[PDB]
RNA sequence: AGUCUCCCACCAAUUCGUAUGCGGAAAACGUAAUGAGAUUUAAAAAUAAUUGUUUAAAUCAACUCAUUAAGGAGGAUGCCCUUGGGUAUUCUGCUUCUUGACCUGGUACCUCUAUUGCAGGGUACUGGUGUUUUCUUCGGUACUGGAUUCCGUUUGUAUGGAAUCU
């Protein structure tokens, strides 16, 4: 399994997560792009600043006193 | 651990414009924690 | 390009009734000439538009419009139960209109 | 045959739920997060369908095929491409890539089991009442 | 007699409007050149082939001037087409001191000749 | 004069002077708010849209989009004649007195 | 508070200094006879050394010391004779005057250094270079007729 | 500028359904009246962010914490004023009403699985702290770029179904 247990919690390893699933990623990329899969350029465009958002905190919230 | 690194390099050369930067500026985390913050 | 007189009023379905904003039929886009705009000034359904206006002015029909205002949970349950319909050949994500258990909403444009 | 695909799918659903519970507060306002939520809900629906098929002790239900074919045509053909495009755009942005790659791989893996069960029970679909 | 003229029906889908310059009678020459160059550069990323240049009435002369400029200056293929444009005119019909703006209206069609000018890359 | 409606006691207690549009929370989370004339309207969205409104809503041709304005603050009166089962000979004079006789014409009536 | 840089674009033009051969008078003919080519003995450290020598000989000691702190040749190739030199915004005029006062190479004689575009960014410099290269092809295509 | 916080999709509600000093969509946000406090304290020092000094420690000024729910009516007191009216404080007291902490068991009625005992869901009522020790995110729905083509339709819905490429 690509994930492991620890004393703290349950952690995920990216390495095996993508290494075990390589042929599936290849099939997905060939299903999305058929003629540009053999090429190597920049296909995906940058996110527009209008759609860009900001990151919040990891805590829940703070109650009033 | 050469092959999966090369594959994700080929993966970044599609989205990003300079694929070799996230590894040098240490932007590809090998581990990501999944636990409610205490 | 349109003339001054252009007022279209009717009774529309609830906006939450729709799942996605599906676009209307676009196949007669090329065959749009001035004859249609010329005939628009002649052809005009005064009766139905006046009925909708009188329904919006009168406070009894305006209150009856709030007869059965379904909740988001009810609309989600209807969308979930339409997943199993009698025609088992086409996927429908919307929900049909009912002549009894549905509110008629009047619009003015 | 179905047991392996169902086990793999629900096992990856575990990771879907875990990563969602982890990254909720960080990116509540995002488009890739919304696509992730929709995909998680669809996967939960399909998995609970297959579980209802399983604990019945024998694999037969008629509404099950209908609603599974309903969800199959939604998950495979339409929702897939926008999901992939957003998942690759959020990683091309450069802000958060280490989980974007995992998201892409997770979509790639959840698509394969879907098409696998599709091609497995297409014969059942053409057998029962349609196609 | 008082009579006003509205513009002509324009039905553009999403991209026929983008790669198309409508040359007015008051549009300057250099601004037209600049916008035509911008359109020519942005076409193949919009996904088209040519740039439409539409003008009718008084602007036809300078539209043909813009065309023959890029014809030999940049050596780019040009295509000229002669079309008819129907315009609706709102006139007052005879049939109290009232403003002439608020009066009975009648629509009348009028046909005019126009030139469409496509420029290749 | 019709009073404030009954929404949420918490939010209804906040205003107490200036009424709220049915999209108050939405716009307040999107645009800036202000209170001028017994009401609370929007001023301008957070993102700058000087050149955006020009190319979208203006008289330009290159308009691929739409702009939505919350015009619920505009108050309206519906006036009807109950004195008779006939034409509005009373509303004729009422409108001719209120507005110029531009309004009281054959065009806007027919 | 912020390091302000400014790049200078320069070109090497060879005038047809030959009185025994008559020349054709037009646009593209003189453009081709002025943009013929650069000699083989052309490099980045050979042009930087020459411009440093010229700057030290014309301005002086402090005049060369103040400009030689951030004086580098970023991009240059001998195929078209277009180079981009980096310098500061304070000594940019001094670098332009040094480019103007460039007499000759140690082995190659009879050449002119022409500064074309100067700006504080490399993207606009590349854009202007592409625009100039596109403009050059127009007169060529017109004269080939 | 700054390792600070928050908005930038909704949710008659497992979704902070929060009428709680005032304003505010929120804010680890502004300000108002009173009382007290100094490692002997609720908490700052000489065993989340920020700042070179980094609140106070005769009085003032500054920081922290602890109370004061919105509107209408009656009485008393103080001021201009002495028919009367206006403002401020204090006591009695009414109006402001969406059959909702969560969860377990029993009873009563209806529907599906195509006879029943039984199996699951919903609603109305009663009883109880019931191992709600994961005291930090765990609910539902939503294809938001553009182009074109095929098919059915006054027997029913006046519009719906699906396909290719970027």
Curated annotation (Swiss-Prot), chain B:
Cellular compartment(s): Nucleus
Assigned protein family: Belongs to the eukaryotic/archaeal RNase P protein component 1 family.
Function: Required for 5.8S rRNA and tRNA processing; associated with RNase MRP and RNase P.
Subunit structure: Component of nuclear RNase P and RNase MRP complexes. RNase P consists of an RNA moiety and at least 9 protein subunits including POP1, POP3, POP4, POP5, POP6, POP7, POP8, RPP1 and RPR2. RNase MRP complex consists of an RNA moiety and at least 10 protein subunits including POP1, POP3, POP4, POP5, POP6, POP7, POP8, RMP1, RPP1 and SNM1, many of which are shared with the RNase P complex.
Protein name: RNases MRP/P 32.9 kDa subunit
Gene name of the record: POP4
Section of the entire sequence shown: 2 to 39 of 279
UniProtKB/Swiss-Prot annotation, chain C:
Domain of life: Eukaryota
Subcellular location: Cytoplasm; Nucleus
Phosphothreonine PTM positions: 86
Description of how the protein assembles with itself and partners: Component of nuclear RNase P and RNase MRP complexes. RNase P consists of an RNA moiety and at least 9 protein subunits including POP1, POP3, POP4, POP5, POP6, POP7, POP8, RPP1 and RPR2. RNase MRP complex consists of an RNA moiety and at least 10 protein subunits including POP1, POP3, POP4, POP5, POP6, POP7, POP8, RMP1, RPP1 and SNM1, many of which are shared with the RNase P complex.
Chain's role: Required for processing of 5.8S rRNA (short form) at site A3 and for 5' and 3' processing of pre-tRNA.
Miscellaneous comment text of the record: Present with 846 molecules/cell in log phase SD medium.
Protein's name according to its UniProt entry: Ribonucleases P/MRP protein subunit POP1
Organism: Saccharomyces cerevisiae (strain ATCC 204508 / S288c) (Baker's yeast)
Phylogenetic placement of the source organism: Eukaryota, Fungi, Dikarya, Ascomycota, Saccharomycotina
Gene field: POP1
Curated annotation (Swiss-Prot), chain F:
Whole sequence portion shown: 220 to 329 of 875
Additional note from the record: Present with 846 molecules/cell in log phase SD medium.
Entry function: Required for processing of 5.8S rRNA (short form) at site A3 and for 5' and 3' processing of pre-tRNA.
Name this polypeptide is given: Ribonucleases P/MRP protein subunit POP1
Subunit structure as annotated in this protein's UniProt entry: Component of nuclear RNase P and RNase MRP complexes. RNase P consists of an RNA moiety and at least 9 protein subunits including POP1, POP3, POP4, POP5, POP6, POP7, POP8, RPP1 and RPR2. RNase MRP complex consists of an RNA moiety and at least 10 protein subunits including POP1, POP3, POP4, POP5, POP6, POP7, POP8, RMP1, RPP1 and SNM1, many of which are shared with the RNase P complex.
Protein source organism: Saccharomyces cerevisiae (strain ATCC 204508 / S288c) (Baker's yeast)
Subcellular location: Cytoplasm; Nucleus
Signal peptide range: none
Curated annotation (Swiss-Prot), chain G:
Chief site of localization: cytoplasm
EC number(s) on file: 3.1.26.5
Keyword tRNA processing: yes
Catalytic activities: Endonucleolytic cleavage of RNA, removing 5'-extranucleotides from tRNA precursor
Gene Ontology annotations of biological process type: intronic box C/D snoRNA processing; maturation of 5.8S rRNA; nuclear-transcribed mRNA catabolic process, RNase MRP-dependent; rRNA processing; tRNA 5'-leader removal; tRNA processing
Sorted UniProt keywords: Cytoplasm, Hydrolase, Nucleus, rRNA processing, tRNA processing
Annotated localization: Cytoplasm; Nucleus
Domain of life: Eukaryota
EC class of the enzyme, as a word: hydrolase
Signal peptide: none
GO molecular function, one term: ribonuclease P activity
Record GO cellular component, one term: cytoplasm
Stated role: Component of ribonuclease P, a protein complex that generates mature tRNA molecules by cleaving their 5'-ends. Also a component of RNase MRP, which cleaves pre-rRNA sequences.
The protein's assembly and partners: Component of nuclear RNase P and RNase MRP complexes. RNase P consists of an RNA moiety and at least 9 protein subunits including POP1, POP3, POP4, POP5, POP6, POP7, POP8, RPP1 and RPR2. RNase MRP complex consists of an RNA moiety and at least 10 protein subunits including POP1, POP3, POP4, POP5, POP6, POP7, POP8, RMP1, RPP1 and SNM1, many of which are shared with the RNase P complex.
Family to which this protein belongs: Belongs to the eukaryotic/archaeal RNase P protein component 2 family.
Extra remark beyond the main annotation: Present with 2230 molecules/cell in log phase SD medium.
The protein, known as: Ribonuclease P/MRP protein subunit POP5
Organism listed in the record: Saccharomyces cerevisiae (strain ATCC 204508 / S288c)
Name of the gene encoding the protein in the UniProt record: POP5
